[PDB]
């Protein structure tokens, strides 16, 4: 469960990263989802 | 108004900045477990995405 845990805290972390990277490009429909994503995973 | 549009270049451009930068902020903060600052980070990046 503590790794699980870790693991989904990673992948918040990598659509982040994900998002970071789509607005090097103004593109904001993609990272507007990912970072919707990020929020939806971090609350549940 | 080739200064004015640049202006605008600048601060739709300076607000980009400011998403990525509170998604920087949350993926460190997130190192610490630290849940309540990365949630409020995100939610500021996503609120300021929205408003462009």
Do not use: G, V
């Not at 918040?12 to 990020?38: F, G, R």
């Amino acid at each position: 469960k503590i790794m699980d845990r870790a693991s989904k805290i990673e992948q918040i972390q990598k659509l982040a990263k994900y998002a970071i990277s789509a607005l090097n490009y103004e593109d904001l429909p993609t990272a507007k989802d990912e970072l919707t994503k990020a929020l939806d995973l971090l609350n549940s």
